[PDB]
Symmetry: D2
Subunit: 427 residues, 4 copies
């Protein structure tokens, strides 16, 4: 007998789901059966155990029926969902050292509590709050520890933005960087071509310590289905769009001190594009992006908390010129990939800043338009897509859809992770 | 169905056994069946789960066959032994905040990981390294947390000695003191009449927050059996005792900065007692207690690492005048109790300083001789036992044995703990 | 020669001033000359050194010209203002362990760096972020440490509200509680009769370890001057009050998870008081206290960020019935004291909940009206002040003003602190 | 005016002096005048401020008259010695996070408390216990922080030995590694050619972030003076050497878990060298290196706590064949350099393992004999020096002395540090 266990240590995805990490666990479970089958062929019966911190039932994103739905899903295939002790209220999902330390201690605990039940463990840790688990396991776990293979992912402190990471983030990510040159069994999962190179030069990570975990979408999921032109209009009707104009649309987290999504940038570009209406959908009401649109005097449609069903309609209409992604340094943003796959039959084309993963998702100009991160060049970016014949429009639209089939199919890509890890499990 | 679980969170007793905590777990398991039976009568099927930190197989006191013997013992009655992630080498058994914090996080984890399996949990935590578990559980564990009843024991930072506790010890014991006035479900286990009063006045612990866990011996164990006068002489023969003299004997940890066992005190008393030979058995060779005996010019027998089989012979001989216990402030020392029960048919009588639990174990003079902690009064203490007729000698020897039957029978006393906790479990 | 130094370790008051602690430092400096003179008479030349954490010039409450004005004020009398290393951005003023630990290390540093320059030091520490300084100084500072006398003040973790203090707050305040029974030189400054009793029963603080620091106002300051009836009307004109009605007014921090100021309570009482208009002035715009006033259907005047000049006018008008203070458990709220002294010639009377210091500032009914913290009894409280003849109104108004002269004169009260500390400095 | 300050943040050297760091401060002060003069020529009046943690007067290495002698030395040239708050007893000199964190907070405090007094600061930090000071200063110190230039030195966690650095050491050294690619003003001082390359590949330190601080001796000091052949014999007489034999000598810290000095290696080589007597001088009595010499049956002279005056005599005698240095991975050991300079007229030659700085101090075979770290090759190393004519002996002895004049003159080398730092101070 050789049972294999995949321990997903994730800061959200069962009790709460704001986004990002949450979505990765969403897609994770829906593909467990395919991985069970595929890994069966290599001779492993795979159990999934998922670890997530205790939350208090009053937290942003808390859904108790999603919690039970996730708990029975893993029970039914011989796994388990284990709520983990961090050191908090339970109402944040983040914090500092105490949290990162309690949570990484008991995550390492879960990884050993199931390295005894099993014959091998691939422990996928994500976020600085779980960066201390690989060294915690390899230092003290003894023979249980040689069974585990660690792939830590989802973020390592960098200098690529103006924000200086907190001392706690620096400390945690400093550990895994150390334990990758101390241990066979410690690797980093890169979510993109960008973070692949960045993390190897910033941290002195050995070349073989890097294992692929490239960000992606579930192409064949229900939410990415192609809509027809009135289901388009029904959902767009409530959003109060202006009766005339073409649209450039963006969505994601609101802009904050650490994180700059390029919303103000397009509002300033629009000052100089006669028939364009920016449509910016933030996760919370942003009063300043209005005050800016008022100052700059550009007609903007600003919306809050919009369902991906009403956005995937927006991205599909014949009135939508482009979807715009202008983050400061996005390590693994997937919203651009969703925009190219949801506009395969009809839609916007993708404009992407020249900063993070953004250029590799648009294949450096072949599947999208890349602009520098300034108002004059984003105005030019919008103009260039306008100066596109009906035929160059849909050959680039086809090439984008062809890109998410080729490099960003989640099915394809978490098998790439799993197989890369299971190879290292030999002997 | 109502299964009950007892989680013993202890810093030693399975992989290593130096002493103190180790011995408490020794006696703990040998009485599990009696508690299972007794608690059955109250309507609870009781599982035992034991938590202890990962050690590296090179640590002082590490015995791998004791580890498996303890692991199969709990497996065989439906429990488990869970090795816990602290944050260390694994070669100390103590440390500072990081250790106390990792270990108390994953101890709280174990307590919740088994509060889900069960209907009620009495979690016995011991030492500052597990003081943060009660608040960790009650703060974040939600409904799982109302199932648990916490009794933290074995030591709370005090001012009764000249040593100032480390800042980490102050921090940990500061938590439990807080959570006892925050929560129904948090209590302190006092191991003695002394620490009972001390901890209630030092920490502002509510009167009902105190639950009994009074230190004790397993009377009917094999090691406390009464020996006959040549098995006495065989074991004493190798120890190189002087051919003439009567003995005053002491044993325990060597004297150190935080801890003062009163060894130097008796050596100085002996300066003024003509027929007395101090016999001091430390756990390591003490070169200074020799240099002192050389300075003071008293004939002393100093021994290292001696088996309780050779000490229980020493305490039983007709040449042994007294066993002496002169600790600075002993909260729960049990070596005095072992000395009175091992000398029931014949032996030494007990001299005890006026400081810690020492006076309550000798019943304030009725089962032993109490002295102040100075050389002149310990010399007087030895003299007084000499000035004891053959008849007052054995009526006090009988009264001591009667004391360990009445107040320090481990059987009797961990039932006292268990029943006190299970009562609080109502509703 | 015997120079004495007062080290004020405070989390705000020079670079930033939100409120509370800030105001205490405001009043602190304006009375330094009086203390220098008064302490001169006892034979001490007193220097003031003030310690406050580094802030980044973008923080809420940052005023660089107040920083220089405070820096030259202390330079000019032979003291100094020392910006202290905490471990942060510098943009919060609070945080967790890392902050509390860096800031208390370097606060203890400052206290020793000036215990060498001087002959005695009274170090007034305030907030959990400086609770670890007394033990840090007394443990390691040696002979420098016997020169210092510590009075830690401004807050100790309690259970009197529904909020459970963070683990870091519990840890810090757990230290000072320990060091008060370890050391002569460690005391707690109680800011009120309430926190005096609360802290002695919660923490097992020795009776002599408690030293007075009772909260207060600077009576004779410019802002508390009695206004005349049109300067009243000028400032009230912009605030958009309704042309008919009598007023019940409240102000302070907005209501939050840890802190409940009783704003919603009065809005619910007003449902049943025909001629009353609640006027609630929060520090930020509160959208929920509007939605509540809309639900409850009561006419409320809600205002943001209002200057004490426009509030002291509101409290003085003949149309103002009462000022209301309904905090959950206010340890040292001073806004009630400002309301009684600013309405000596004419104004509101004070309604106070039965919870914190609130009852002792209104002398248990003799200088104000005390109500239970529920909507029906606050409605009754308002009614009772209405049922007050013109003559019982102004005899209670006189008795209140007489109370702040007798017990809450800041001049009188920080001399009470200083003298209580300097007495302990003998020998 | 442009005053410059050098802040030496060092864990020992004033109150205690065990060795290593202590000696570096010894040599540091004796050369302050030369640096003051030399830096004067570049236009800087230089003050020296030294920071060291509070110790308790009972600590190993505590010398109060060395403390005052160091305190008046810096006072007399316009500097100061500042005792720093760490978070301890004060009786260790090392510890874990709490210590490293308190000590680095108040070290950063001292660096800013004197960046205000001055126009520029070169802050030399040493050891993991001061690694967090550069980021602490550059993050929060604002304009004061642009004045400081940081050179952290003396050790960065590595994997070159079998020992795994503590998690606290990994955390601290992880900070400085981050802040060197975040900041102009953060550099690493390499003490050797070895650690220069090691640290740049382990930590991804930018090439320009590396500044020289190469370890060295004060050639012209009193202790390195050439002795004549009876002052040789007087000091060797008490040491109980055997009347016949040639000597191979080693000294330094005793061998421990983290640190392996190669003592057992030579004892095993001696098994196969007929006329050789190993003379090993440890800092404490080593009972195991005797038991080994007894097992291996080799005549060894083992000595404790020997004064450099009796060792520099041993290294100078005609009966001394070689001095041996066989550390596992010595980053900056200077005892080899002392051995080559103290045997310029007559002495031993130097045998050096192939591991750390050891090969670069013997210039790869030109100034010494390099061996692999095994008993058979150390036996060969001793043989090869025997197979050396009287003339190849003293041409290699001359080339060694020529090496410490050329690369390891402390005078020359701390000027190299100072000048490298002051160049970066431009603008």
């Amino acid at each position: 007998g050789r049972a294999l266990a995949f321990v997903w240590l994730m800061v959200e995805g069962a009790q709460v789901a704001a986004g990002g990490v949450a979505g990765y666990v969403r897609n994770l479970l829906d593909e467990q059966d395919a991985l069970r089958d595929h890994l069966a062929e290599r001779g492993w019966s795979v159990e999934f155990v998922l670890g997530e911190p205790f939350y208090d039932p009053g937290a942003p994103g808390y859904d108790e029926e999603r919690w039970r739905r996730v708990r029975e899903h893993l029970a039914a295939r011989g796994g388990r969902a284990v709520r983990l002790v961090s050191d908090s209220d339970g109402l944040d999902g983040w914090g500092e050292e105490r949290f990162f330390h309690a949570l990484s201690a008991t995550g390492a605990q879960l990884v050993l509590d199931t390295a005894e039940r099993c014959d091998a463990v691939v422990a996928v840790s994500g976020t600085s709050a779980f960066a201390r688990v690989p060294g915690m396991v390899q230092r003290q776990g003894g023979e249980l520890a040689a069974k585990v293979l660690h792939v830590h992912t989802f973020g390592l402190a960098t200098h690529d933005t103006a924000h200086v990471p907190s001392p706690a983030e620096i400390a945690a990510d400093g550990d895994v960087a150390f334990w990758t040159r101390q241990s066979d069994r410690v690797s980093v999962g890169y979510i993109s071509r960008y973070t692949a190179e960045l993390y190897a030069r910033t941290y002195a990570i050995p070349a073989a310590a890097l294992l692929p975990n490239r960000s992606a979408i579930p192409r064949h999921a229900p939410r990415f289905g192609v809509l027809t032109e009135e289901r388009i209009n029904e959902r767009i009707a409530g959003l109060g769009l202006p009766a005339e104009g073409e649209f450039v649309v963006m969505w994601g987290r609101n802009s904050a001190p650490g994180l700059d999504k390029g919303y103000h940038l397009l509002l300033e570009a629009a000052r100089d594009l006669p028939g364009v209406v920016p449509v910016i959908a933030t996760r919370r009401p942003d009063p300043g992006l209005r005050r800016l649109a008022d100052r700059y005097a550009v007609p903007a449609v600003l919306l809050d908390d919009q369902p991906f069903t009403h956005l995937s309609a927006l991205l599909q209409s014949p009135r939508t010129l482009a979807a715009a992604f202008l983050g400061e340094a996005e390590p693994g943003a997937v919203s651009p990939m969703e925009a190219m796959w949801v506009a395969r039959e009809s839609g916007a084309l993708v404009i992407a800043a020249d900063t993070g993963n953004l250029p590799e998702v648009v294949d450096d100009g072949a599947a999208g338009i890349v602009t520098r991160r300034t108002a004059a060049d984003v105005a030019d970016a919008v103009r260039r897509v306008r100066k596109l014949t009906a035929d160059e429009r849909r050959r680039m639209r086809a090439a984008a859809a062809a890109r998410v089939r080729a490099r960003f199919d989640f099915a394809a890509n978490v098998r790439e992770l799993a197989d890369a890890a299971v190879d290292r499990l030999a002997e």
